[PDB]
Amino acid sequence: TLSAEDKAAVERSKMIDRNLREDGEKAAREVKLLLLGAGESGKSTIVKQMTGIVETHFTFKDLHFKMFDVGAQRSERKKWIHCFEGVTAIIFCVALSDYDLVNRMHESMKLFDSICNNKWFTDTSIILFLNKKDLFEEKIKKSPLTICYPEYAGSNTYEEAAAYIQCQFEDLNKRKDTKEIYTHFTCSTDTKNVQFVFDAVTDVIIKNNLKDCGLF
Amino acid sequence: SIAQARKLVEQLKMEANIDRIKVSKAAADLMAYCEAHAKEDPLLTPVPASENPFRE
Amino acid sequence: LDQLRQEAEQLKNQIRDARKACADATLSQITNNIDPVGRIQMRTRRTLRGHLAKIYAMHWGTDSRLLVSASQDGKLIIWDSYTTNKVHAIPLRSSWVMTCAYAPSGNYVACGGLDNICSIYNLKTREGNVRVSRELAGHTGYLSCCRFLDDNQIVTSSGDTTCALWDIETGQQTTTFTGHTGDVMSLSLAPDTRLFVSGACDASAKLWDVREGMCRQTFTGHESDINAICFFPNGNAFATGSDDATCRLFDLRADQELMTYSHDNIICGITSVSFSKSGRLLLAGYDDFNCNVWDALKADRAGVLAGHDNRVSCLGVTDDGMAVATGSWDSFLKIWN
Amino acid sequence: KKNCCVFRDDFIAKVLPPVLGLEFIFGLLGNGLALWIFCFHLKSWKSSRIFLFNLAVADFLLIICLPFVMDYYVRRSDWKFGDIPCRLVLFMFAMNRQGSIIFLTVVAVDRYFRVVHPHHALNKISNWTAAIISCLLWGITVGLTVHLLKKKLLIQNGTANVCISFSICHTFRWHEAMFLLEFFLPLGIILFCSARIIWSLRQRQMDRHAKIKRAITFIMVVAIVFVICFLPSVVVRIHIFWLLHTSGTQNCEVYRSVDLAFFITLSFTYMNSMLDPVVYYFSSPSFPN
Ligand SMILES: O=C(O)c1cccnc1
């Protein structure tokens, strides 16, 4: 019953639908990562080895990643944090050379507590990066690990310094049945952090596929 | 500093001399508007299924 | 110094005293004798498919047939509501879009989001494609709403606690509106296009003056962030939806609050607020996947619009008042009637 | 003709009916409930859901076709119906058997491409493509099972129309070959796929999670069920193959007891039709237990 000029409009709509479907299929094969931190915490170097939103694209082993760095957004985080509900994982950058200064480790712990226990990210895995290892060496050699963390029962060597900073961060997780925290003690130049991110995302994707099976 | 407080208090004076009518008159005007245009609203007075463009 | 402090306090007390003195009878007492509107039942007449992500905004055309929707998958689709056809599909540079608008003439659309930029698109060109005509920059925070005044003017509100009036011909801020102390989340234009109201996150709403000046009303009363706002068709009242699961109707001439539309089974916040052509029904969108219809003159619920499988994020009513369209986070639009 | 020798020896008619009834009630309940959940009760619909739904459809056809089974069994065996009904029942049985097996194998292969190759493009295919594959496999199995329709399968020894498609003859025809293949080839594919899924998850240190353990167990149990169900029948079939090849066609005594044995084990092929729903649909964190 359609007229001459209605069938052509239907055909145009069908072509638009086909283009939209193709674009969606192409865009469903990419990994989306959200990058967070406390500022001047090694985000720059982490981006190096790999206004508003600052996207960044890189490829590794025939896999296309996208890293979103919110950065300069100084508005209320509560009003736009739900836009990233479907990200594959969250990368969190912490500097180990900030314990003897102002306290910033407490701010980083507060931000990690706020993000990890958010209601939107109840199943989003978190990849923890601990930076400034080289400076941390002499910093713990000179300054003891008590100015920031009182009631510390341990020595002043790197053997215990690496721990008791990972344990506290991993203890802020409360739903230890849906998400997992991956930790890496990165440094200034390692050239292997991309492999760590790849492993974490492969685990996450395997879990999502198993969920899609219904197995699940 | 004091400039922001001065601006705020100036805004307060500016909003402090507005003319205000009683609530009863506003209520009556709201009722009058809601009653006058009562037949022209196809949502609370459903139209027959011959002039409905979304029928089917 | 202090003298400013107690001067401000005394002015606030005087304003409260005047507001209280102007109150003699509530709206419930005036509208007690009005008969109930009865149960309002609407059925989904159309469903628009094609978005592959959460839908964040929508707007109707002035001809009550074409509408534009924005979603997080980076697309801006223009629909033909009568036949559910697609007319255009504009790909955006930034996928983080949270607002859209449709020009009264029908030649332009707008969008914006976390990129802090409002983009204007031209739909009627001699080349048969939609191209960007101007990108407006200057806001230092995410854009939350935008509305067309003409083909050469647009009002935007952003997350840097400011609202600005632009000039699309030159891309410059003609006027800047300041006074809020929180993210501005929505705005609505008066029918005569001379005043507009904004709802910020400081639990307050203000009435501006587009021609010249600044705020003059500063209505208060909510207990949390205001997410939506809408003018009454008469142009002498407006409604606000907030995060405390409460909608309120404010009046301009008496400068007060008339009613509150609350319940006891509702605890989730309101995402959108709209009126009807007569102004008797008030449609609101909630986070519990529903959409309630409130008798505006009696503050009594008179229907439910169920059928969405996720949060209802946008809502609109046609100019002729013949349909209601709701978008949600499950990537579907439904036209009710 | 005069190359086959069949019987019907009471004992089968004595034992089977309660067993078919017990399987029938549970199968109807489970698969009807499963279909009811699948339609207008389950919102999300992905490819694996389509494959599981097709498995449910085949299983459902088999359960609605069980009632008649108590016929060449009740009243010993007379099959009061005609030629066409006999052909229809036998064809439907075979079709439903091979469709369910094919969809089990498809499910196993689909789960193999999601743990061993998580980034393969096969893991994200359109629902339309899933429907196309479903129709193609349905066509395949029907095409393999049409040869029953042409021939006559109502051989009657007198006052007893013995509706059987399994007769002791020496031709290695369509039916026996497909009966052996539908076990052996899907067994190989399932055992290969289930081995890699368990071993990759074991090696990449994913066993520490709690949900992974249940998935591992429920992957092993699927192979256990498939092996406990279809194996005895083909074992008995190969056994009678050995006797039939070593012997001739006469001396029917050697072929006497093998009949009731074959059908006793054949009852397990439907016993699968009732054990399948719980294992595949019900036993899954996807829908709340
Ligand atoms: O294939 C079957 O399931 C079958 C064939 C014959 C008789 N009863 C069952």
Swiss-Prot record, chain A:
- Reactions catalysed, as given in the entry: GTP + H2O = GDP + phosphate + H(+)
Q: What is its main location?
A: nucleus
- GO MF terms held by the record: adenylate cyclase inhibitor activity; adenylate cyclase regulator activity; D2 dopamine receptor binding; G protein activity; G protein-coupled receptor binding; G protein-coupled serotonin receptor binding; G-protein beta/gamma-subunit complex binding; GDP binding
Q: How does it sit in the membrane?
A: Peripheral membrane protein; Lipid-anchor
Q: Which Pfam families does the entry mention?
A: G-alpha
Query: Single GO cellular component annotation?
Result: centriolar satellite
Annotated region (G4 motif) at 127-134
Task: Summarize the subunit comment.
Answer: Heterotrimeric G proteins are composed of 3 units; alpha, beta and gamma. Part of a spindle orientation complex at least composed of GNAI1, GPSM2 and NUMA1. The alpha chain contains the guanine nucleotide binding site. Identified in complex with the beta subunit GNB1 and the gamma subunit GNG1. Identified in complex with the beta subunit GNB1 and the gamma subunit GNG2. Component of the TAS2R14-GNAI1 complex, consisting of TAS2R14, GNAI1, GNB1 and GNG2; within the complex interacts with TAS2R14; this complex plays a role in the perception of bitterness.
State what protein this is by name: Guanine nucleotide-binding protein G(i) subunit alpha-1
Native organism is Homo sapiens (Human)
Q: Which gene encodes it?
A: GNAI1
UniProtKB/Swiss-Prot annotation, chain B:
- Where is this chain primarily localised? membrane
Keywords associated with the record = Acetylation, Cell membrane, Host-virus interaction, Lipoprotein, Membrane, Methylation, Prenylation, Transducer
Q: Which GO terms describe its cellular component?
A: extracellular exosome; heterotrimeric G-protein complex; membrane; plasma membrane; synapse
Q: Which GO terms describe its biological process?
A: adenylate cyclase-activating dopamine receptor signaling pathway; cellular response to catecholamine stimulus; cellular response to prostaglandin E stimulus; fibroblast proliferation; G protein-coupled receptor signaling pathway
Q: How does it sit in the membrane?
A: Lipid-anchor
Instruction: Please describe the quaternary structure of this protein.
Output: G proteins are composed of 3 units, alpha, beta and gamma. In this context, interacts with GNB2. The heterodimer formed by GNB1 and GNG2 interacts with ARHGEF5. The heterodimer formed by GNB1 and GNG2 interacts with GRK2. Forms complexes with TAS2R14 and G-proteins; these complexes play a role in the perception of bitterness. Component of the TAS2R14-GNAI1 complex, consisting of TAS2R14, GNAI1, GNB1 and GNG2. Component of the TAS2R14-GNAT3 complex, consisting of TAS2R14, GNAT3, GNB1 and GNG2. Component of the TAS2R14-GNAS2 complex, consisting of TAS2R14, GNAS2, GNB1 and GNG2.
Name of the protein in its database record: Guanine nucleotide-binding protein G(I)/G(S)/G(O) subunit gamma-2
This protein's gene is called GNG2
Swiss-Prot record, chain C:
In the record, the effect of residue 103 to T is given as: In MRD42; decreases receptor-driven G protein activation; decreases complex formation with gamma subunit; decreases trimer formation with alpha and gamma subunit; no effect on protein abundance
Homology family:
Belongs to the WD repeat G protein beta family.
Official protein name in the record: Guanine nucleotide-binding protein G(I)/G(S)/G(T) subunit beta-1
Q: How does it assemble?
A: G proteins are composed of 3 units, alpha, beta and gamma. The heterodimer formed by GNB1 and GNG2 interacts with ARHGEF5. The heterodimer formed by GNB1 and GNG2 interacts with GRK2. Forms a complex with GNAO1 and GNG3. Interacts with ARHGEF18 and RASD2. Forms complexes with TAS2R14 and G-proteins; these complexes play a role in the perception of bitterness. Component of the TAS2R14-GNAI1 complex, consisting of TAS2R14, GNAI1, GNB1 and GNG2. Component of the TAS2R14-GNAT3 complex, consisting of TAS2R14, GNAT3, GNB1 and GNG2.
Q: Name one GO biological process term.
A: signal transduction
Source organism (scientific name): Homo sapiens
Q: Which GO MF terms are attached to this record?
A: GTPase activity; GTPase binding; protein-containing complex binding; signaling receptor complex adaptor activity
Q: What is the effect of changing residue 115 to G?
A: In MRD42; decreases receptor-driven G protein activation; no effect on protein abundance; no effect on complex formation with gamma subunit; no effect on trimer formation with alpha and gamma subunits
Q: Where are the WD repeats?
A: 43-91, 92-137, 138-178, 179-220, 221-264, 265-306, 307-337
Phosphohistidine: residues carrying this PTM: 263
Keyword Thylakoid in record? no
Q: Is Repeat found in the keyword set?
A: yes
Swiss-Prot record, chain D:
Q: In which tissues is it expressed?
A: Expression largely restricted to adipose tissue and spleen.
**Cytoplasmic topology ranges:** 37-49, 110-128, 196-222
Top-level lineage group: Eukaryota
Disulfide bridge positions per record: 86-163
Q: Which GO terms describe its biological process?
A: G protein-coupled receptor signaling pathway
UniProt entry tagged with the keyword Transmembrane helix? yes
Q: How does it sit in the membrane?
A: Multi-pass membrane protein
Q: Which UniProt keywords apply?
A: Cell membrane, Disulfide bond, G-protein coupled receptor, Membrane, Receptor, Transducer, Transmembrane, Transmembrane helix
| Ranges of the Extracellular topological domain | 72-88, 150-180, 243-259
Which GO MF terms does the UniProt record name?
G protein-coupled receptor activity; nicotinic acid receptor activity
Transmembrane spans: 15-36, 50-71, 89-109, 129-149, 181-195, 223-242, 260-284
Give the UniProt entry's GO cellular component terms: cell junction; plasma membrane
The text of the family note is: Belongs to the G-protein coupled receptor 1 family.
Reported function: Receptor for 3-OH-octanoid acid mediates a negative feedback regulation of adipocyte lipolysis to counteract prolipolytic influences under conditions of physiological or pathological increases in beta-oxidation rates. Acts as a low affinity receptor for nicotinic acid. This pharmacological effect requires nicotinic acid doses that are much higher than those provided by a normal diet.
This chain's protein is named Hydroxycarboxylic acid receptor 3
